[PDB]
Design a protein around this ligand. Sequence first.
Ligand SMILES: Nc1ncnc2c1ncn2[C@@H]1O[C@H](COP(=O)(O)OP(=O)(O)CP(=O)(O)O)[C@@H](O)[C@H]1O
Ligand SMILES: Nc1ncnc2c1ncn2[C@@H]1O[C@H](COP(=O)(O)OP(=O)(O)CP(=O)(O)O)[C@@H](O)[C@H]1O
Ligand code: BEF
Ligand code: BEF
Ligand SMILES: [Mg+2]
Ligand SMILES: [Mg+2]
Ligand SMILES: [Mg+2]
Ligand SMILES: [Mg+2]
Lengths: 130, 130, 219, 219
Amino acid sequence: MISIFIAEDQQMLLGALGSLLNLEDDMEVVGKGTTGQDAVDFVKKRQPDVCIMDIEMPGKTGLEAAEELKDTGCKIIILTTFARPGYFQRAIKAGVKGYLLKDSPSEELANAIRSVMNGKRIYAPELMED
Amino acid sequence: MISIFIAEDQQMLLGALGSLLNLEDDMEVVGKGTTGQDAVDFVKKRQPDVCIMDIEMPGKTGLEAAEELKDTGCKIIILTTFARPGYFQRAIKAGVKGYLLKDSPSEELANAIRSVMNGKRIYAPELMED
Amino acid sequence: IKLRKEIERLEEKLEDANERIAELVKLEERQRIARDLHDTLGQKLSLIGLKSDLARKLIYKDPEQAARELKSVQQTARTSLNEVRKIVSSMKGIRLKDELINIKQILEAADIMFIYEEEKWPENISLLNENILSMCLKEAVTNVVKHSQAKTCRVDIQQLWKEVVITVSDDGTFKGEENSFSKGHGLLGMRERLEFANGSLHIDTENGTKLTMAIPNNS
Amino acid sequence: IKLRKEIERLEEKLEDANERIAELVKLEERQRIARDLHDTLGQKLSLIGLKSDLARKLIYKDPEQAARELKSVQQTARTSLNEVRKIVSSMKGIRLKDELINIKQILEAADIMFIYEEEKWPENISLLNENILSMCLKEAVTNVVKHSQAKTCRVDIQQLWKEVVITVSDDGTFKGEENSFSKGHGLLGMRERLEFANGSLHIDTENGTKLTMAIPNNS
Ligand SMILES: Nc1ncnc2c1ncn2[C@@H]1O[C@H](COP(=O)(O)OP(=O)(O)CP(=O)(O)O)[C@@H](O)[C@H]1O
Ligand SMILES: Nc1ncnc2c1ncn2[C@@H]1O[C@H](COP(=O)(O)OP(=O)(O)CP(=O)(O)O)[C@@H](O)[C@H]1O
Ligand code: BEF
Ligand code: BEF
Ligand SMILES: [Mg+2]
Ligand SMILES: [Mg+2]
Ligand SMILES: [Mg+2]
Ligand SMILES: [Mg+2]
């Protein structure tokens, strides 16, 4: 079993992501949050296997939250909608294990969670364009 | 049974509209077209009960095609995505029985087809704004 | 007479340029709202995709939940197209400072006391989010002039840590009947715009009518 | 010395205005492509809604067809978000006249003869549609320089009654293997952009490789 924390500000999206990951036989969503602070508070206390995390969130951002959980051993996968200047750079500097597009199929996301758990690092070509 | 001609330039949309209307027990799609000319050619030859028609279509437009089928007795319902200047006016001048938003539920469209067949005229508030 | 003719020829082309800068400055603010819409259409399109992926996975496991997700996908596409229509029509987006001015004059013309204790103005919301809040505040007072039958109307505009909250309360009586969210009505349309923006609407009809419109901050 | 100081103060503010008009004129052409995108997002959002309505109605009648419609809804949302990303990144849209110039120079540098019999230029396509065709023509010749192993490359740009057709044929050999439309590749990406625009891509690998890219006219 692979435990997952999901941090997403978009409530409808946070729901669908949680339902999709839960549907996997080997994964289970153990926590959900709407800001980078909820992710920081949760992984510090409970410490899950993987932390799926949105970038643009009010309060604390996903990049800001990755920067605070740098020395924690939790595998952070970052999800974002738009490739923006400095996002890719800030993510690699934080030591994230994955950097993916939010709307990529659930199969790919589930694969990336299993790949990240097997030490691999998956980054998205579309998010590194220009 | 209510026979229907559908004229829509968007191929994926023309498919879904045809499948949705066909699913109604009392309706059946008897013809499909991608331009206002296909609608003109069909209703002139076969003459269906109702003619569902897109506005913005290459070649001949739906308003242009309504203007040529003015004295035909075919009940024309117009569908459009955006309320644009002169569209509402041109449609009433042509004598259309319905003027609706394309993305309105299938239930409403099916209702409007039955209402138009019972002599009524259904126009959309959103399409008459400013 | 040659230099006086030449000065008038330059005065006429400088009038076409310094004045034509005021025409082209309108496209700069329209680009700010178009980039606001594109940002949340990105969130909306991501949601449609993910909810379709989920409804497809549920067709066999829970067909009733799949149907519920598809009604929700259809609504997100309908409402997010309503916002595209709004900017394709180039309808004017009102500033919350200007709408607060109008609501005070509408409430006073209808003889309803306006209660407002001014605090720090919202600073971390997008122009599109602010425009939605203006339409919501305008609809809230329109409902209070037509239906409430209230003596007073208290408006609050608050800038919180992660959101901007507008509360509009009247001391009248709620005239709605069961389905107070009817098709093409103000309350339903307010709920749709607020939900598109990732905000919310809560109505408390206990002790009058209290509308709570929240909208998130950026970054 | 006062009027010479005052003339330099006006020469400096006229340089900020006639030159700053050239900065603000960039937002005018960006508004033309944003209104092009909003128009076809209207068609895309209408399609997502209607296809969700249909897949919901099919959950019980034909669950396999419902799943097929939902894969198609997910694709429309994915591709129509790819176009929003393209204009949020402000990537330069190339004019078909300029891309035809570059493809001739790329084909000549790679020692492949360029065959082009010039006809009437397309006039009834949007700037966004023209930009898609440029990206498609650019990818077509990129594939012919890397894989075809062709002596010649014939390009045709035609303006038909209801559409603009670009044919790109090389006299080499098609190196693809079964799934020649792989993820994140040029051919798949060309098919996605063309289908978003309501156009099409057809590949004839008999007697070399012939790509037929069609895109519709406006109105
Ligand atoms: N502040 C308020 N006090 C009392 N009743 C109210 C109210 N706001 C709304 N209502 C009730 O809810 C109903 C629905 O309100 P809503 O704003 O959706 O539509 P409406 O009747 O104002 C027409 P429109 O679409 O132009 O807004 C009203 O007709 C009224 O009965
Ligand atoms: N004109 C042509 N002649 C011969 N083979 C071609 C061809 N166009 C495409 N192919 C074949 O189809 C494959 C897939 O083409 P495609 O453009 O999708 O990807 P690619 O190999 O060029 C990498 P990219 O994603 O950068 O375009 C090529 O690798 C080649 O085998
Ligand atoms: F808003 Be998240 F970065 F997609
Ligand atoms: F393109 Be149609 F008028 F919706
Ligand atoms: Mg976010
Ligand atoms: Mg059309
Ligand atoms: Mg109202
Ligand atoms: Mg290629």
